[PDB]
């Protein structure tokens, strides 16, 4: 709470990250952050906060920081912010209009990448509706885009809601696939249990 | 103005491609899907194969699988046949059909179609 | 693959008479994915039924369907002059999605 750095190492350097449509939090609490060394890392591509000051974040306490990790491609990153349309922010992540946090992503191709392909990470394609803000929809039902029933088979109009990405070595930088880290600061009439140093 | 416009006439040699472009405007496109349908001349209408536009999922018939490859480009709203090793018995009219789309819903059949390609192949 | 037949290969009529031509399937299709398109010489095909028995957007209503199964039926109750043309039937409920053999209505003079 006071003698214990943020374990931020578990969500960066994480082994595995999770697919977008499937996304994963983290709660952070009771810890000492250090800001200020994750902003000027020459690590990552984008650091982009909403409703805070970056270069302040040191001198400013929460009650609670949430982590949402998940990985995308390049030219998806800009979707993670508050009022984005798109695959990623109507149907897998949406960011509420009053965000704020910092949005955090690198270029993870020496990872995510497979000889023939990483088919692993899966990202939401169609949907009924957009997701609300911090919405998760991990349903694998058949996407009905048509009047008439799917009775759980796919065919004309009647889709699986999930689609893989392709990520290869030899892909452009803007299909390469991106790790993104977004920590939302939470602030409550409570304690506040998570502040810089 | 729901539409499907798609390319000119064509006129390769045999053992040639031909790549032939359906371009959708009017509707969504990203949620639709576009089947391909060719027809010689006085002959029925007969099904090459269909491509779902948001995923890029392909079904080809059984006498095309060997030359036919069904792509689209969401950037540009448009759907592509491709076929290979083209020989004489090819020659014929190429149709583009797909439902029409919002940004959730679908028409319930094919209720768009192109103008048509004429393709033809001989020496 | 499901083979679709359609007879009579000519129907000869005469304007205000009425037209019922039938598409049948070797096998049991799914009804909501049955349509049937009509042609003109030189134009691409018209959506006029879908789901064996739903009109399309703009058809006029002497365009009737029916048919489940593997037995389908296109009724054309006062034969226009505009209607003589040919017309196919397609099932898209199984890949691949197959068409009938056409059948051109004409002009019984």
């Known amino acids: 709470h006071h003698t214990n750095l943020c374990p931020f190492g578990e969500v960066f350097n994480a082994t595995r990250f999770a697919s977008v449509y499937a996304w994963n939090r983290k709660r952070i609490s009771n810890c000492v952050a250090d800001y200020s060394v994750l902003y000027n890392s020459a690590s990552f591509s984008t650091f982009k906060c909403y409703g805070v000051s970056p270069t302040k974040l040191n001198d400013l306490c929460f009650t609670n920081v949430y982590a949402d990790s998940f990985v995308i491609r390049g030219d998806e990153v800009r979707q993670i912010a508050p009022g984005q349309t798109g695959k990623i922010a109507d149907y897998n992540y949406k960011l509420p209009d009053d965000f704020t946090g910092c949005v955090i992503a690198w270029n993870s191709n020496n990872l995510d990448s497979k000889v023939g392909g990483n088919y692993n990470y899966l990202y939401r394609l169609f949907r009924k509706s957009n997701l609300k803000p911090f919405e998760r929809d991990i349903s694998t039902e058949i996407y009905q885009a048509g009047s008439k029933p799917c009775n759980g088979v796919e065919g004309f109009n009647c889709y699986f809601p999930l689609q893989s990405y392709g990520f290869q070595p030899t892909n452009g930088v803007g299909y390469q696939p991106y790790r993104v880290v977004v920590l939302s600061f939470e602030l409550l009439h409570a304690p506040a249990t998570v502040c810089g140093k | 103005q729901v539409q499907l416009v798609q390319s000119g006439p064509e006129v390769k040699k045999p053992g040639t491609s031909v790549k032939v472009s359906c371009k959708a405007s009017?509707?969504?496109?990203?949620?639709?899907?576009v089947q391909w349908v060719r027809q010689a001349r006085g002959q029925r209408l007969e099904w090459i194969g269909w491509?779902?536009?948001?995923?890029?999922?392909?079904n080809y018939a059984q006498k095309f699988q060997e030359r036919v490859t069904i792509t689209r480009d969401m950037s540009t709203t448009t759907a592509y046949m491709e076929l290979s090793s083209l020989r004489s018995e090819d020659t014929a009219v190429y149709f583009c059909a797909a439902p029409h789309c919002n940004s959730t819903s679908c028409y319930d059949a094919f209720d768009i179609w192109g103008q048509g390609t004429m393709v033809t192949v001989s020496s | 693959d499901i083979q679709m037949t359609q007879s009579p290969g000519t129907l000869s009529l005469s304007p205000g008479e009425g037209a019922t031509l039938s598409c049948r399937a070797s096998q049991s299709v799914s009804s909501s994915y049955l349509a049937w398109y009509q042609q003109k010489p030189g134009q691409a095909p018209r959506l006029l039924i879908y789901?064996?028995?739903s009109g399309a957007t703009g058809i006029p209503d002497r365009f009737s369907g029916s048919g489940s199964g593997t037995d389908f039926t296109l009724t054309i109750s006062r034969l226009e002059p505009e209607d003589f043309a040919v017309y196919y039937c397609?099932?898209?409920?199984?890949?691949?999605?197959?068409f009938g053999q056409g059948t051109k209505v004409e002009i019984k003079r």
């Open positions: 789901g064996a028995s």
């Open positions: 491509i779902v536009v948001g995923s890029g999922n392909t």
């Open positions: 009017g509707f969504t496109f990203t949620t639709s899907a």
């Open positions: 397609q099932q898209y409920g199984s890949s691949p999605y197959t």
